[PDB]
């Protein structure tokens, strides 16, 4: 059902998706009872278009856990990597 998937997104020039959630992020459109970070929109031309989909829950980025992370911390981390972000996501498959 749920699986942990690894994808690597190349910045071009950013990752090309949006996130909602996080501790203090006011929730997410998918699992309201989950504090986690969720992919919310994916740019169709962008570097994440073949890799991520709305609803994916990011649990790790370049080795950093996204479990029990604040919205702003999650955003800043993703933005501060210059070139590539290896993500572990949880997806309903």
């Amino acid at each position: 059902s749920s699986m942990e998937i690894r994808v690597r997104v190349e910045k071009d020039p950013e990752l090309g998706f949006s996130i909602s959630g996080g501790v203090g992020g006011r929730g997410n459109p998918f699992r309201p009872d989950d504090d986690g970070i969720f992919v919310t929109r994916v740019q169709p031309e962008g570097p994440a278009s073949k890799l991520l989909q709305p609803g994916d829950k990011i649990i790790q980025a370049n080795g950093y856990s996204f479990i029990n992370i604040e919205h702003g911390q999650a955003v800043s981390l993703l933005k501060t990597f210059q070139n590539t972000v290896e993500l572990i996501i949880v997806r309903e498959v």
Binding site: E14, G25, H71, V75
Partner: peptide
């Protein structure tokens, strides 16, 4: 914010 682009 609710939704933030990265």
């Amino acid at each position: 914010g609710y939704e933030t682009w990265v």
